[PDB]
Amino acid sequence: SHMLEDPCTSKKVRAARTLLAKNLSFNITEDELKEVFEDALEIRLVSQDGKSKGIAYIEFKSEADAEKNLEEKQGAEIDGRSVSLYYTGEKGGTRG
């Protein structure tokens, strides 16, 4: 419990190396997201209550990875639409 410095439970620190991909398409998929980032641990998908909406989660190995990729690409113009990058280490907010 002593640790050196991390009185936040390391809960909101994991989302720092992860970001949400948006503006995707009904054709793109984790593959295109994994092919666009090619620098994260893995990407997740996200649609409506039950219908592809074009959203996907993305967790990199570190904030610099999710950030360098989210910025180095940001959109990457794919499926006729650039995949939007929505971080989640200090921006999103959903009391849950």
Residue 94: CB atoms within 10 A of its CB come to 5
Q: Between the CA atoms of 70, 48, 26 and 90, what dihedral angle is there, to the nearest 10 degrees?
A: 0
Q: What is the CA radius of gyration of the chain?
A: 14
Q: What whole-number distance in Å separates Cα of residue 46 and Cα of residue 52? A: 7
In the chain, where the domains are located: 1-96
Is the domain spanning 1-96 CATH 3.50.50.60? The answer is no
Query: Residue ranges of the alpha helices (H) in 1-96?
Result: 30-37, 63-72
Q: CA-CA distance, 45 to 58, in Å (whole number)?
A: 9
Task: Calculate the CA 93 to chain-centre distance.
Answer: 15
Among 34, 94, 82, which Cα is nearest to 54's? Answer: 82
Q: Which two tokens stand for residue 43?
A: 């990407």
